[PDB]
Nucleic acid binder design. Structure first.
Ligand SMILES: [Mn+2]
Ligand SMILES: [Mn+2]
Ligand code: NA
Ligand code: NA
Length: 327
DNA sequence: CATCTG
DNA sequence: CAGATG
């Protein structure tokens, strides 16, 4: 956790680069298990050969760990941190809508900067365009104080459209958190579930309302169950307009809301632990459901949930207020 | 995983 | 349709 940090860190720099610059998914994948194991490792790795001893740890890594222990640096890491190409890709990538794949093409065409991008707005698709337009706003965290206003709106409007809607803002917002990166709204409706054959309007009606009132500003992606957008709290009495925030809205069959809501609420750690305990308790849990575990190996059949309560109960556990869902 | 692009 | 992005 700090005993083999540098090592796990450099490993991660390397791993990342294989994947983002080169295409070395294998190698990439290589540095990854490596850090994963050294990460777990109980002692202070004093040398390569020692590490080597571990699984995932081969000869090349070993080598690298040595140079790093040997000197506060690694040549290769130093070579990569300079190199403009490598840099460009890590940068372009910051634009919403540009993955590495695209980052490569651009750089190879000579687009390496924000300006470059503007000048070639032609080569970008809608998502990317938006991503470019809101570069700054998108990188800005979301203060809970804005979150509440946001949540306040969405909730009111969904209500207007149909009393039967059920929305929840999951994410860290939900677990307390003073600020967040984006807004994640979970949505269901009684009339939408597991077997029920669709109802697209279910998700399209709300989106529309939100745009109606000008909360949602742009569309990144609109499907029948998932919507990726941009929203914004109405700038009061002109002098202070808000940033543009990322927002997502997803439809869920009522017969699996809570599991979803449980799940999205996280933290990752809380999940796992709960996940592991469910397992003990003779159960199964994933994004959408909880199932009684047979003995023959595994086994299914969706246990029926009406709240986050129903879940814990099942696995027989202390109902956890979202705040203390941390780890 | 669901959506988009081409 | 494969392949990209979130
Ligand atoms: Mn989130
Ligand atoms: Mn998001
Ligand atoms: Na990106
Ligand atoms: Na292939």
């Amino acid at each position: 956790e700090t005993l083999n940090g540098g090592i796990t860190d450099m490993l991660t720099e390397l791993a990342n680069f294989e994947k983002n610059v080169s295409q070395a998914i294998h190698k990439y994948n290589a540095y990854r298990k490596a850090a994963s194991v050294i990460a777990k490792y109980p002692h202070k790795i004093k040398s390569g050969a020692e590490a080597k001893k571990l699984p995932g740890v081969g000869t090349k890594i070993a080598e690298k760990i040595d140079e790093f222990l040997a000197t506060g640096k690694l040549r290769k890491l130093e070579k990569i941190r300079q190199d403009d190409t490598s840099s460009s890709i890590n940068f372009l990538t910051r634009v919403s809508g540009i993955g590495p794949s695209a980052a490569r093409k651009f750089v190879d065409e000579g687009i390496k900067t924000l300006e470059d991008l503007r000048k070639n707005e032609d080569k970008l698709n809608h998502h990317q365009r938006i991503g470019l337009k809101y570069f700054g706003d998108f990188e800005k965290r979301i203060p809970r104080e804005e979150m509440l206003q946001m949540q306040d709106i969405v909730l009111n409007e969904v209500k207007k459209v149909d009393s039967e809607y059920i929305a929840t803002v999951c994410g860290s917002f939900r677990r307390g958190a003073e600020s967040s990166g984006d807004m994640d709204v979970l949505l269901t409706h009684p009339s939408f579930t597991s077997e029920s054959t669709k109802q697209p309007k279910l998700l399209h009606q709300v989106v529309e309302q939100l745009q109606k009132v000008h909360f949602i500003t742009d569309t990144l992606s609109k499907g029948e169950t998932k919507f990726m957008g941009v929203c914004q709290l109405p700038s009061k009495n002109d002098e202070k307009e808000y940033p543009h925030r990322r927002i997502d809205i997803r439809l869920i069959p009522k017969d699996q809301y809570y599991c979803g809501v449980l799940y999205f609420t996280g933290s990752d750690i809380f999940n796992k632990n709960m996940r592991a305990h469910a397992l003990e308790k003779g159960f199964t849990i994933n994004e959408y459901t909880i199932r009684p575990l047979g003995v023959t190996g595994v086994a299914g059949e969706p246990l029926p949930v009406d709240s986050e309560k129903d879940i814990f109960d099942y696995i027989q556990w202390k109902y956890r207020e979202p705040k203390d869902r941390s780890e």
